[PDB]
Enzyme design. Sequence first.
Site, PDB file in Angstrom:
ATOM      1  N   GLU A 166     -11.158  31.744 -19.321  1.00  0.00           N
ATOM      2  CA  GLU A 166     -12.367  31.525 -18.513  1.00  0.00           C
ATOM      3  C   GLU A 166     -13.480  30.821 -19.228  1.00  0.00           C
ATOM      4  O   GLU A 166     -14.360  30.289 -18.526  1.00  0.00           O
ATOM      5  CB  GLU A 166     -12.878  32.886 -17.976  1.00  0.00           C
ATOM      6  CG  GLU A 166     -11.918  33.601 -17.047  1.00  0.00           C
ATOM      7  CD  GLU A 166     -11.689  32.903 -15.711  1.00  0.00           C
ATOM      8  OE1 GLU A 166     -10.820  33.403 -14.946  1.00  0.00           O
ATOM      9  OE2 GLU A 166     -12.322  31.877 -15.406  1.00  0.00           O
TER      10      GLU A 166
ATOM     11  N   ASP B  91     -16.836  26.742 -10.870  1.00  0.00           N
ATOM     12  CA  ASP B  91     -15.492  27.025 -11.371  1.00  0.00           C
ATOM     13  C   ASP B  91     -14.487  26.008 -10.833  1.00  0.00           C
ATOM     14  O   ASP B  91     -14.826  25.025 -10.180  1.00  0.00           O
ATOM     15  CB  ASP B  91     -15.103  28.465 -11.059  1.00  0.00           C
ATOM     16  CG  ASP B  91     -14.722  28.756  -9.635  1.00  0.00           C
ATOM     17  OD1 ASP B  91     -14.344  29.919  -9.363  1.00  0.00           O
ATOM     18  OD2 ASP B  91     -14.733  27.852  -8.803  1.00  0.00           O
TER      19      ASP B  91
ATOM     20  N   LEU C 289     -17.701  35.148 -11.025  1.00  0.00           N
ATOM     21  CA  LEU C 289     -17.962  34.515  -9.724  1.00  0.00           C
ATOM     22  C   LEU C 289     -19.226  35.088  -9.135  1.00  0.00           C
ATOM     23  O   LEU C 289     -19.384  36.301  -9.019  1.00  0.00           O
ATOM     24  CB  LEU C 289     -16.795  34.752  -8.807  1.00  0.00           C
ATOM     25  CG  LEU C 289     -16.927  34.161  -7.380  1.00  0.00           C
ATOM     26  CD1 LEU C 289     -17.066  32.648  -7.390  1.00  0.00           C
ATOM     27  CD2 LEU C 289     -15.723  34.626  -6.560  1.00  0.00           C
TER      28      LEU C 289
ATOM     29  N   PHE D   6      -8.407  39.350 -11.976  1.00  0.00           N
ATOM     30  CA  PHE D   6      -9.689  38.784 -12.353  1.00  0.00           C
ATOM     31  C   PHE D   6      -9.885  37.421 -11.686  1.00  0.00           C
ATOM     32  O   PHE D   6     -10.974  37.101 -11.246  1.00  0.00           O
ATOM     33  CB  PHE D   6      -9.751  38.754 -13.880  1.00  0.00           C
ATOM     34  CG  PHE D   6     -11.078  38.393 -14.432  1.00  0.00           C
ATOM     35  CD1 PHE D   6     -11.507  37.098 -14.522  1.00  0.00           C
ATOM     36  CD2 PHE D   6     -11.896  39.411 -14.928  1.00  0.00           C
ATOM     37  CE1 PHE D   6     -12.719  36.786 -15.087  1.00  0.00           C
ATOM     38  CE2 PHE D   6     -13.103  39.104 -15.523  1.00  0.00           C
ATOM     39  CZ  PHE D   6     -13.495  37.783 -15.590  1.00  0.00           C
TER      40      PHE D   6
ATOM     41  N   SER E 123       7.131  38.760  -6.013  1.00  0.00           N
ATOM     42  CA  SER E 123       6.941  38.764  -7.458  1.00  0.00           C
ATOM     43  C   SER E 123       6.663  40.160  -7.984  1.00  0.00           C
ATOM     44  O   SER E 123       7.185  40.516  -9.068  1.00  0.00           O
ATOM     45  CB  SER E 123       5.798  37.850  -7.896  1.00  0.00           C
ATOM     46  OG  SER E 123       6.045  36.503  -7.631  1.00  0.00           O
TER      47      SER E 123
ATOM     48  N   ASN F 215       9.434  33.052  -9.549  1.00  0.00           N
ATOM     49  CA  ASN F 215       8.805  33.286  -8.285  1.00  0.00           C
ATOM     50  C   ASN F 215       7.273  33.139  -8.318  1.00  0.00           C
ATOM     51  O   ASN F 215       6.660  32.598  -7.384  1.00  0.00           O
ATOM     52  CB  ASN F 215       9.191  34.650  -7.743  1.00  0.00           C
ATOM     53  CG  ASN F 215       8.746  34.850  -6.331  1.00  0.00           C
ATOM     54  OD1 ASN F 215       7.711  35.465  -6.061  1.00  0.00           O
ATOM     55  ND2 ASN F 215       9.477  34.345  -5.385  1.00  0.00           N
TER      56      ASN F 215
END
Length: 164
Positions: free
Chosen positions: A11, A20, A32, A104, A117, A132
């Site tokens: 990040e 972002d 965010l 996150f 998945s 996957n």
Amino acid sequence: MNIFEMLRIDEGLRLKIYKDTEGYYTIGIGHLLTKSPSLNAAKSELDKAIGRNCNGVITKDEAEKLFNQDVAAAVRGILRNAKLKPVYDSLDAVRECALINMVFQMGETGVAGFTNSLRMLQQKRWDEAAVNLAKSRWYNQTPNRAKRVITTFRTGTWDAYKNL
Ligand SMILES: [Cl-]
Ligand SMILES: [Cl-]
Ligand SMILES: [Cl-]
Ligand SMILES: [Cl-]
Ligand SMILES: [Rb+]
Ligand SMILES: [Rb+]
Ligand SMILES: [Rb+]
Ligand SMILES: [Rb+]
Ligand SMILES: [Rb+]
């Protein structure tokens, strides 16, 4: 390597509001602020988050405070989510970091939607899960970060993050 170091690589750290990779106003270590296109809306969110009138700029200590909150809340939320909790608990501590990283980035609902998945992960079918996971908007839009996360799931090692 640990979840904080991993997410700090993925990040970055910025002390002023920025957009972002989805175009959304963010600050700190991937915090965010809002999906609104209004910078004023984002600035209001920021001031509320930090508890002081910021006009868009925070300190490193403040960024780290939001980051610790966000990681803690991602873990806590996983453990309260009926889809994600069993998978989290079934995984070793390294692979758990990959799951926290996904939450996150895309939020609990988003991750909880990776039904196939998640099943493969709980079955410990690591190579199948990795195949996957890549068949996703997630992977297409952020392929290098998704590759790192997926390698973490596939291997249970930090190989994709060790020297970053
Ligand atoms: Cl917040
Ligand atoms: Cl497999
Ligand atoms: Cl597949
Ligand atoms: Cl990427
Ligand atoms: Rb970022
Ligand atoms: Rb804007
Ligand atoms: Rb565990
Ligand atoms: Rb985030
Ligand atoms: Rb689903």
